[PDB]
Design a protein around this ligand. Sequence first.
Ligand SMILES: Nc1ncnc2c1ncn2[C@@H]1O[C@H](COP(=O)(O)OP(=O)(O)OP(=O)(O)O)[C@@H](O)[C@H]1O
Ligand SMILES: Nc1ncnc2c1ncn2[C@@H]1O[C@H](COP(=O)(O)OP(=O)(O)OP(=O)(O)O)[C@@H](O)[C@H]1O
Ligand SMILES: Nc1ncnc2c1ncn2[C@@H]1O[C@H](COP(=O)(O)OP(=O)(O)OP(=O)(O)O)[C@@H](O)[C@H]1O
Ligand SMILES: [Mg+2]
Ligand SMILES: [Mg+2]
Ligand SMILES: [Mg+2]
Lengths: 51, 67, 98, 81, 109, 51, 262, 285
Amino acid sequence: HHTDCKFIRVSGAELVQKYIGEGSRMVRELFVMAREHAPSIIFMDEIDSIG
Amino acid sequence: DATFIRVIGSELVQKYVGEGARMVRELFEMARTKKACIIFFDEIDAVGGARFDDGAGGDNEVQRTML
Amino acid sequence: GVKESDTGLAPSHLWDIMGDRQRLGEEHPLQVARCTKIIKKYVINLKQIAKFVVGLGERVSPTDIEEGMRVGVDRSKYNIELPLPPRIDPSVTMMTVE
Amino acid sequence: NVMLEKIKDNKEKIKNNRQLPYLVANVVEVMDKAAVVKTSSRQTVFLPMVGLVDPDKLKPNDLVGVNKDSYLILDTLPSEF
Amino acid sequence: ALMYGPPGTGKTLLARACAAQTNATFLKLAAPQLVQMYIGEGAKLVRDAFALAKEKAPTIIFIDELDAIGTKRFDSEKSGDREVQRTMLELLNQLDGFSSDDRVKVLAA
Amino acid sequence: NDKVRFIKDELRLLQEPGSYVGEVIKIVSDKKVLVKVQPEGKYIVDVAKDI
Amino acid sequence: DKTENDIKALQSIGQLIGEVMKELSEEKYIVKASSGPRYIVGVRNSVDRSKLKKGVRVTLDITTLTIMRILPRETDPLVYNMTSFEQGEITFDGIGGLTEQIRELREVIELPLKNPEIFQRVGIKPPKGVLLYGPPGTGKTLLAKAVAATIGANFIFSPASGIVDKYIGESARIIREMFAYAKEHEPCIIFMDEVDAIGGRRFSEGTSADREIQRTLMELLTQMDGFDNLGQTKIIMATNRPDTLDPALLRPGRLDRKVEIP
Amino acid sequence: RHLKRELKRAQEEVKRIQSVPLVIGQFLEPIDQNTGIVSSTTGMSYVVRILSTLDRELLKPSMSVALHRHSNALVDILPPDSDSSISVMGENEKPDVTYADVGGLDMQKQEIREAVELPLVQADLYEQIGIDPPRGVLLYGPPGTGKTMLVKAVANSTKAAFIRVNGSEFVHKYLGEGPRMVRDVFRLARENAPSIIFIDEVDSIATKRFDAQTGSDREVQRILIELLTQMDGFDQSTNVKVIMATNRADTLDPALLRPGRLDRKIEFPSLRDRRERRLIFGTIA
Ligand SMILES: Nc1ncnc2c1ncn2[C@@H]1O[C@H](COP(=O)(O)OP(=O)(O)OP(=O)(O)O)[C@@H](O)[C@H]1O
Ligand SMILES: Nc1ncnc2c1ncn2[C@@H]1O[C@H](COP(=O)(O)OP(=O)(O)OP(=O)(O)O)[C@@H](O)[C@H]1O
Ligand SMILES: Nc1ncnc2c1ncn2[C@@H]1O[C@H](COP(=O)(O)OP(=O)(O)OP(=O)(O)O)[C@@H](O)[C@H]1O
Ligand SMILES: [Mg+2]
Ligand SMILES: [Mg+2]
Ligand SMILES: [Mg+2]
């Protein structure tokens, strides 16, 4: 909020994704939206407690 | 100088079952029409596996394209 | 830019005499369909899902019309003009031939 | 001789509509006397049934031809395959 | 009537020769066709292999292979056996007695 | 007088042969614009003398 | 006259069916056509405004679009093919040696149907729902013919793999219309035969076909038990292996008796 | 005086265009106010002039509307009460279950009289303390817990409008049908506030895994995205935000359960104790 980053919470959620429909191979597209709209914080919560 | 028709045997696989059924049919007709052909199936260890029945996996898609 | 570069080049100017009297003809379009039943007249199924009974063309032999064959039919009132070879699934099988 | 030319009169009209082309639809229900068909253009139309076409051939599900221009049951056809 | 055993015993070769020789109308069917990728097109192919066969009855449907739909597995846990098994059960309904199917036979190899 | 002449002409303006919402995929330096009609397929079509 | 009746049909045209979706005012009604788009239309004055209500089918004009008149409810072409199968009948006897099990199915079906006065006085809510399961080859199916012949109430034999179609959302709309159908024609019995097709469980990580099942099965679950509770419907369900079933169909209070045929 | 005859002859003309036959679209948003974007009910977008001399007071928030046929012009507006997916059920007779037939589950009964009943009758107790009332209510458990029985019990006593629907009423079968019905249900509720909205089962719609390679995945998914954006608008209206239930809570999509839409999770136990099993026997006895 102070730095003026777009806070993009990424999560494994495919509800928001509709253009490619999965984030397994989305890399360039998340960068190219966050590079236009820099500055950005991509908050990668990797869960790693799913058993 | 007889028509050569290369296939990749691991090109057939998709998630929607018997999707490689359509392919295998139409390829077989396309080779039937031209006279003197050779149909060269490489790398048929995928779709060319042993006769087995796991009882729990997804070997059911795989064994469609073989039958 | 691409500054207006479109294939054709120097012979396509002589083609413009021949291809302007045919382009206005209804030779094309023939909405491509496919037969579902020869009833000893013919039953086609369009690929939009809407079924029609059509009939012979200008001089086509009754041997041409076969089961599961595609045919082109008159754009307006449906009638077989020119039969066409079978199945539009071949195309992933013609790129495998070296 | 005057009556016989009234049957020919009707029939030359009837011969022009009977020939190709005509949409193909099936019979939702016979409501009786009325025939409701759901077409292969995926709507529905309530029509006064053609009486030259028997109400015997028209049973629920039957496959019948229908004229596009005026939705009337034109003729009967053996169920496709 | 079912034909099973080792390969090479001419199972597929005999059946054909004797079903065309006796002038009983011999339909050619291969089980891998009843498998489909559309949802509900395999259930519409079985009823349509049946509806043709009630008219010309008695007639012989010869199924070459039967391991395409003949999986014991239809208690499964996340597989495409939920679409395949739907054309096996539409079989057992179009094999129950309702007359005008009392006269359809079956070979299966 | 202005008022009864707003109504008579608003009857002409309200008649629309048709108007869509498209979106510019990409321009081409032919003075044409590749516009995707948003439910349908694509159409390449040039600009008016307004833009 | 036989050629003259055809000329009197020819001057007619189809009249698009709808139903009255919702009264807007006194002189405008909204219909939902069967081609698709909702319209706002006018009324012929032959028919009162009280005869119309929301959910009566109406015919419409070609292009002017006016309600012409009220029609009875349209009946599906699928629900006429299911009523037809009764060929193979047999009376009370079915599986000989299991006449005790034949009485257990009549306790659920034939006794409150004929005399609802025996279940009023005792005070248990009327039953409904029977599952048949056993070693395959045992005549689960022969008993279904025995209880549809003798009772004489309307029977509808609906194979479960024979209502999945290519179109999706069409296997929901059909089977909704059948539970209405069983209320109108009461008493009525719906025999679901070979329920192993739509017996897939939660899953919905595999193919998109596995989510066609789950979406068509949720609608059978809230239609069977929800706010909805249709009193004049009985369900008899035939299944081979009784462990395919989703754990919402194992579940008593859906399905009073869980009969095992030995 | 002659021009007063001519204002009347021009006023007549235009009222005939206002009235029947009309197709029903929807207003998305203005781009001016004499021109707007409507989606017809053919599944296409049109840019249409707006008949001046109309109320934009209810128009600007998205809401049903009437359009002309050939012309395609917005000739008048329709109430948000009119052209709704479902007539309200609070005017029909009340569900047959009352609180005499609820037996046990007395622990979930004190968490539902607070969450549902109290914010309709008295909005002024929450605000003056300074607490926000719970927004959406979730019910989850094994499939026999008699979730629905508790909801019927609270529906008879409130005597406020009710709207009851399923999650396979929204099933896709025309183009763009699925997104259209979600708008109609949230706009009826604000119009006749207060009310309780129940969606009975929502296990098929909320999926944890989409791939969006088939059309039927793109219709399910357009519905669910629309449902989040309409629960946001629904905040600060007397209606207690949508109650919904699921039988297996482990397919629940993460954006749905996130706060701002659903806040409370009324678990329905099935072990219970000896004083709460007794009661279940006593009302069926
Ligand atoms: N009993 C037999 N007598 C004469 N020829 C035989 C016999 N069995 C097999 N053959 C020969 O073997 C050939 C191949 O047999 P075919 O492939 O039809 O049998 P199969 O049991 O169906 O084996 P598979 O299907 O496993 O390939 C036959 O065309 C025939 O020439
Ligand atoms: N109890 C019985 N009394 C008389 N005949 C029987 C009996 N059980 C089975 N049959 C015979 O077996 C045939 C097929 O059995 P049926 O199809 O009714 O069994 P099922 O349990 O429904 O098996 P499936 O549905 O797995 O095919 C019957 O059509 C009938 O000839
Ligand atoms: N506390 C109780 N008192 C009296 N009866 C009860 C009680 N709890 C459950 N029941 C009985 O169990 C039945 C089924 O439960 P209910 O109709 O409320 O559906 P549900 O459990 O929510 O199912 P769904 O999974 O389809 O949402 C009720 O109709 C009722 O007869
Ligand atoms: Mg063989
Ligand atoms: Mg059976
Ligand atoms: Mg419930």
